[PDB]
Amino acid sequence: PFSPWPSFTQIEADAVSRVLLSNQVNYWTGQECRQFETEFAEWADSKYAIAMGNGTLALDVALQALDIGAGDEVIVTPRTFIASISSVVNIGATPVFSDVDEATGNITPESIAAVLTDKTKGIVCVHLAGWPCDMDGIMALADKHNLYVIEDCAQAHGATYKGRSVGSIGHIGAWSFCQDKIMTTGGEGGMVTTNDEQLWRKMWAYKDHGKSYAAVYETDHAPGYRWLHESFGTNWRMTEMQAVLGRIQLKRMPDWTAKRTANAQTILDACAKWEAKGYLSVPRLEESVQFADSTHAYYKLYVYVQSDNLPKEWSRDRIIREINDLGVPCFSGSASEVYLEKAFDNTGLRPENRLPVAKQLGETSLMFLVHPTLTEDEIKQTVQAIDGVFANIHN
Amino acid sequence: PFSPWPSFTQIEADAVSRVLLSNQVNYWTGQECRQFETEFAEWADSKYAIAMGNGTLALDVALQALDIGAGDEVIVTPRTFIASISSVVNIGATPVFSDVDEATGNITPESIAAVLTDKTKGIVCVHLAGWPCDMDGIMALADKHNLYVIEDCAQAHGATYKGRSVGSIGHIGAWSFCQDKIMTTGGEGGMVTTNDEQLWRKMWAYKDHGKSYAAVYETDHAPGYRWLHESFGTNWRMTEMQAVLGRIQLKRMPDWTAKRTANAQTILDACAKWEAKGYLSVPRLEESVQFADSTHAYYKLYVYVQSDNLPKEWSRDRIIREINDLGVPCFSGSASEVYLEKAFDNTGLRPENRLPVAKQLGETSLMFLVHPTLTEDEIKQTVQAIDGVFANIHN
Ligand SMILES: CC(=O)N[C@H]1[C@@H](OP(=O)(O)OP(=O)(O)OC[C@H]2O[C@@H](n3ccc(=O)[nH]c3=O)[C@H](O)[C@@H]2O)O[C@H](C)[C@@H](/N=C/c2c(COP(=O)(O)O)cnc(C)c2O)[C@@H]1O
Ligand SMILES: CC(=O)N[C@H]1[C@@H](OP(=O)(O)OP(=O)(O)OC[C@H]2O[C@@H](n3ccc(=O)[nH]c3=O)[C@H](O)[C@@H]2O)O[C@H](C)[C@@H](/N=C/c2c(COP(=O)(O)O)cnc(C)c2O)[C@@H]1O
Ligand SMILES: C[N+](C)(C)C
Ligand SMILES: C[N+](C)(C)C
Ligand code: NA
Ligand code: NA
């Protein structure tokens, strides 16, 4: 197999062992989560961060703080992991699907505007695979129509939009550190970021059974039982062992982004000849007029077949099989039409017509791995498999 | 300070280090959670178990599977941690408080029956401190009124009721492994247990984004993208590092229950002379005719002041102060009237009048530690602090 992702180091194993043997294992008995919060906020260009159990709970707590619920429409992408949509359903709101950009796979200002109604309250925009959304256009639309924006940053650690971290631009950023993500806190983890003090206080309470931050930290208490629960909430906390991994990985992020970026550019460079021959489309953020001064996180590397130009005996799926047969990982990538899941049967939530760009990218995507442990030889194998298979197509 | 709880061993540190370095860190990339589920189910006398992020999410997923929501009343206890009540509020149902037993601190068949209505659908009974509820009475009452029962077992690992593990008697058992609990999976953790296959399938899907167990494991899959999400759900999963701790601690539970029991017996025995003198009430499960062939988990050890028999210069609160001043941990214990929290302001959820037994136990409780790391000498010091302060009261 190729070099693993995730790939935990002895430093990380020693850190979790130390946290465990300290017995200071909980948000309320140690300081690892609290220091991870302040370090993550600084790293993500945000005033506030809160450590969460996972990226789904991060979306959930953001929707809770924004008072999104029954009768509110929230614009969502069809091209993502289901949590980016089901979080909206689970709070009782109505997800409404926008189509995506043919180059980036993200929802766009134009496709969001097309599905806005007088009931739209929110947008959950996903920075898919690490390519940032057009946040100037999305925030302009949100200002015009009085909408709240949640940036789903689960695939986008290290991405920037015109000089600032993703997750710092919308009202709230939601983050995952699940097992194969760019940051990976020991099996699960998440985070929210915000610049709004009131949204921070609301999310902080909600993930801690409705403990008021003001009651805990900003109030003088008599000895004995303390009355802290000033609203209803739940347990969406992270452990100390997950947090110490997060803190370690923040310090690695420049290295990790640089390695992902180098791996991606080697693969995109090799795909260019097959774009010239008409078999691939190879969108590159660094060559985009509209994503000047932005950076791609490179969670995963997408290119797209030009189906019309493949011989009849070839297809996207056959290319995946042939690259896999040469020992190189290759996938169809993200779900592109999550609304086709049976969860949407009889809900009235499925678009009445399939979203054409989302449908096309589901059919055309080829997805490659670029994670930081991949060796020069593994990236060479990747390039050689692409050249081998497309040379077979070309003859 | 007294011996710590929790108190993680080198064996546990080495196990979490091995899980991390394996890179098999997630429910979907390793087998520690799946083996913990089957071992926990067997240990807890249940056909099915599902690993959960925490005991709050265990309650939440049980209420989801039972289709409890808007317009449904659920009987709850006032004498617990808020999650036993706020889980009901958060799913949209109406918590209705029952008073508690003066000896055991648990809701009783009599006090539950007093607050039943035709809209009651469920009971969340807490085995407080490890003393099992009257499950014959509660299940009889649930049968006659067509109610579902959730056992909140967060404080009750090792408790049995007439030969059976707690958590195996109600429709669903909810469990916590939070940091100071009898089992403590490295900062957070939870579990549900059930004997009902359909409730198991529903909870298993809901904690995993609505992945159907049938779609994942009972369906032959074509190559490429698999359509699994047949209903809506969320991410309420446990990590592999938490699960390996759970598996280790299950094997220690005979020893841990025996040590907690021996510690409790020594303290209760010392309290007997002060009960004889009228200063304490010392309920003992092993002496209760109603709790024959049952066993106490001994999460914490409660006795109760007889307020009426204390001299004017004395109080429950002064006894706590004086025992702590001798170097012995002592607490007022569980919240006894959770409905007094400001979360309940303007909800209409407060009982018309304060619940009198619950109010009394909040005023009279003295709670001592009995966790398995406490040495013979620390238990001796506990007895001597009790004897010193009560000898002062007497003389
Ligand atoms: C355990 C784990 O690693 N889960 C990650 C994984 O989810 P998974 O269940 O495989 O979902 P899908 O990618 O829809 O795949 C469905 C099925 O098709 C198969 N498949 C998939 C792709 C493919 O190319 N080929 C294929 O055969 C899969 O093997 C699986 O059998 O892939 C997702 C993209 C990740 N995304 C999470 C996440 C959250 C939620 O964060 P959280 O996981 O709660 O921290 C929030 N927003 C965003 C934009 C997120 O990305 C999940 O964390
Ligand atoms: C981080 C941690 O260890 N939390 C545990 C702790 O909750 P805590 O926030 O302290 O809540 P309370 O006991 O109501 O105390 C409120 C305040 O008064 C203070 N206090 C409390 C008691 C006292 O004697 N003196 C005092 O000064 C506390 O320090 C705090 O400042 O004490 C609770 C009893 C535990 N209960 C858990 C659990 C779940 C929920 O499971 P989960 O915690 O989500 O796994 C579900 N059902 C059940 C029957 C559960 O037991 C919590 O796990
Ligand atoms: C530091 N960062 C803005 C690139 C995340
Ligand atoms: C049933 N028991 C093994 C938990 C005692
Ligand atoms: Na109903
Ligand atoms: Na009823």
UniProtKB/TrEMBL annotation, chains A, B:
Gene3D superfamilies: Aspartate Aminotransferase, domain 1, Type I PLP-dependent aspartate aminotransferase-like (Major domain). One of its GO terms (molecular function) is pyridoxal phosphate binding. The keyword Zinc-finger does not apply. Pfam families: DegT_DnrJ_EryC1. Transmembrane segments: none annotated. InterPro entries: DegT/StrS_aminotransferase, PyrdxlP-dep_Trfase, PyrdxlP-dep_Trfase_major, PyrdxlP-dep_Trfase_small. Keywords: Aminotransferase, Pyridoxal phosphate, Transferase. It comes from the Bacteria. The modification N6-(pyridoxal phosphate)lysine is found at K181. The keyword Repeat does not apply. GO terms for biological process: polysaccharide biosynthetic process. The active site is at K181 (proton acceptor). Belongs to the DegT/DnrJ/EryC1 family. This is DegT/DnrJ/EryC1/StrS aminotransferase. It comes from Psychrobacter cryohalolentis (strain ATCC BAA-1226 / DSM 17306 / VKM B-2378 / K5). The lineage of its organism: Bacteria, Pseudomonadati, Pseudomonadota, Gammaproteobacteria, Moraxellales.
